[PDB]
UniProtKB/TrEMBL annotation:
Organism whose genome encodes this protein: Pseudomonas putida (Arthrobacter siderocapsulatus)
Gene transcribed to yield this protein: llpA
Protein name: Lectin-like bacteriocin
Residue span, Bulb-type lectin domain: 11-134, 143-250
């Protein structure tokens, strides 16, 4: 498998096998942080415009080895681990990830620039995507996450920025985008729906009278998945785990999502 040029400048994610080159950058969803590859060959993170981090030998859990090939362009990319090819300093700087579990991880692992300024490599699989035309945006403190085993109480408005998810009075389960228009619905209005639940088994289900199934996401059997509504109107169910970060991460620590004072999980990774 081979690489193609990155074309998501200003988004918060660098997908697998895409080449980021000089002048290109990521931004955190809240726009505070920027990850930038400079013309001089330094990979840098800036905080509201000021450099606060540089990729080099001093970063824990990273290695630097010699780059011999003089024909190698200045480039930064992800192939499970992340790599910075910088011939101007005869070096490849790379991340020391957690132990890999399957070759398939190479296709699923992307880099995220989170709202807290951490950059994190995430093994990410979208089990169900209700809104394929709306970009997935990881790492936003804005997003609403529901953990497996969460009831969507009829009539309650669950918000993410200006977007919302509602199990309505008419029985429909609907996600609304920031302009007030519907981005996705289950189409269960007027069928006698009594209950909507993101189950312990990772399945999103709308039940009618007599425990009858009216609609479901077909994501049964993934107890580690989460349901996420983004402020941009995206709704999806994802199975994700981190394999590296610039801070917080240690190879032997347990990964976990940060939580609100309300005990609700936030789309920000931390460790042990």
């Amino acid at each position: 498998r081979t690489r193609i040029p990155f074309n998501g400048v200003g988004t918060s994610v660098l997908p697998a096998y895409q080449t980021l080159s000089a002048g290109q950058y990521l931004l955190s969803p809240n726009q505070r942080f920027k990850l930038l590859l400079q013309g001089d060959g330094n990979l840098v993170i800036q905080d509201n415009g000021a450099t606060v981090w540089v990729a080099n030998e001093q970063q824990p859990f990273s290695s630097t080895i010699p780059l011999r090939n003089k024909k190698a362009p200045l480039a930064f990319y992800v192939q499970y681990g992340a790599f910075l090819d910088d011939y101007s300093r005869r070096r490849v700087w790379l991340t020391d990830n957690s132990t890999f579990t399957s070759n398939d991880q190479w296709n699923r692992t992307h880099l995220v620039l989170q709202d807290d300024g951490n950059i994190v490599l995430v093994d990410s699989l979208a089990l169900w995507n209700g809104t394929p035309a709306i970009p997935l945006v990881p790492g936003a403190i804005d997003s609403l996450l529901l953990a497996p085993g969460s009831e969507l109480v009829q009539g309650v408005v669950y918000g993410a920025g200006a977007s919302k998810l509602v199990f309505q009075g008419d029985g429909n389960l609907v996600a609304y985008g920031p302009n007030g228009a519907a981005t996705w619905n289950a189409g269960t209005q007027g069928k006698g729906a009594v209950r909507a639940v993101f189950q312990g088994d990772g399945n999103l289900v709308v039940y009618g009278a007599g425990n009858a199934v009216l609609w479901h996401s077909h994501t049964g059997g993934h107890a580690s998945a989460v349901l996420r509504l983004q402020a941009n109107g995206s709704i999806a169910i994802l199975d994700e785990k981190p394999v590296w970060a610039r801070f917080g991460f240690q190879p032997t620590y347990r990964h976990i999502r940060k939580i609100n004072p309300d005990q609700k999980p936030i789309d920000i990774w931390t460790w042990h």
